[PDB]
Design a protein around this ligand. Structure first.
Ligand code: A1IDE
Ligand code: NA
Ligand code: NI
Length: 328
């Protein structure tokens, strides 16, 4: 059966919780477990109340995301297709109870300082079920780092890292992220100068520029193993395809166009579209501590602009990694 919140969040862990993120799905908190930073994602399930504009998923409907989180976490310890470019999954629990007052206080603090699009999660009864996923702490998201990156050399490293991670997941799992907006790209400092990945048994390296990227949030993602497909069926979703004011919202429509609204199929082109969306953000909505006013930095900008304008002619992240000139 389910465990109480206190199993996952004993008092000391609970008192160090700070809200760091949110979505229609629920809430993300940061805390410390055994002297180690973690991130906790809490999703309400199985109940009849509306949560953040939507009906709650059933256990069956949340299982895809659990499976996908597990598979992507394992890629860090694999050999033939290996990347640390996702996020570690430490545990998954099914929790029963009302929302802890200390989490509501952290929610309130986030609402006061950043503002929330979500309902205050104070209406859940003591029989409410939740899934609680505990993840490795992956750093700070790219959006919050819009004005903090050193140079376009960093931006290139980020793009390489993302492309390689997606390619390794494509090769191993026929993976599509399907929601890789710039809130879902985390950055963390590293003293490694070179990061390593392996794609179908060929190892290669990427200059880090002092950051390691983690891709997060598999709410909409898709993959398969041994012909069994795991995915979020959004074919009957209205609102996902009606957004505007950001190219992000076009991607959802271009994905639907690419896949003819058949979300079970494999269309790794969706990874290319998200990469294009991300390249666009780097070229337009970000600013660097060091400008591009040296010849060496200028050539990097030209290469990323060239990537922006040619990448949509590639069929997958694998195709980009193996064949685009940006990564030679
Ligand atoms: C939706 N989702 C978020 C996570 C996750 C996993 C690990 N970390 N580590 C840091 C963050 C985070 C999330 C947001 N805004 C800033 C940081 C973080 N988030 C996993 N799924
Ligand atoms: Na990672
Ligand atoms: Ni446990």
């Amino acid at each position: 059966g389910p465990v109480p919140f206190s199993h996952c969040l004993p008092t000391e862990k609970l008192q160090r919780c700070e809200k760091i993120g949110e979505g229609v799905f629920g809430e993300v908190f940061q805390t410390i477990a055994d002297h180690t930073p973690v991130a906790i994602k809490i999703i309400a399930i199985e109940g009849p109340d509306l949560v953040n504009g939507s009906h709650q998923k059933t256990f069956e409907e949340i299982l895809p995301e659990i499976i996908i989180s597990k598979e992507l976490s394992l890629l860090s310890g694999e050999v033939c297709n290996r990347t640390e470019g996702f996020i570690g999954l430490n545990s998954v629990h099914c929790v029963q109870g009302s929302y802890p007052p200390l989490l509501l206080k952290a929610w309130d603090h986030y609402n006061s300082t950043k503002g929330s699009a979500n309902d205050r999660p104070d209406f859940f009864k003591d029989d409410q079920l939740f899934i609680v996923l505990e993840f490795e702490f992956g750093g700070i998201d790219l959006e919050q780092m819009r004005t903090k990156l050193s140079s376009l050399a960093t931006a290139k490293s980020i793009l390489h890292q993302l492309t390689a991670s997606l390619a390794v997941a494509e090769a191993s799992l026929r993976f599509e992220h399907r929601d890789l907006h710039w809130g879902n790209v985390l950055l963390k400092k590293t003293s490694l100068k070179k990061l390593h990945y392996t794609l179908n048994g060929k190892s290669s390296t990427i200059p880090s520029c002092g950051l390691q990227v983690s891709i997060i949030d598999y709410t909409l993602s898709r993959l398969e193993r041994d012909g069994i497909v795991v995915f979020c069926d959004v074919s009957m979703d209205e609102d996902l395809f009606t957004g505007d004011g950001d190219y992000q919202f076009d991607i959802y429509r271009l994905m639907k166009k690419e896949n003819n609204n058949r979300w079970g199929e494999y269309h790794p082109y969706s990874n290319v579209l998200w990469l294009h969306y991300l390249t666009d953000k780097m070229l337009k909505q970000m600013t660097f501590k060091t400008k591009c006013n040296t010849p060496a930095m200028k050539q990097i900008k030209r290469k990323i602009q060239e990537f922006h304008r040619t990448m949509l002619n590639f069929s997958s992240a694998t195709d980009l990694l193996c064949q685009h000139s940006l990564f030679k």
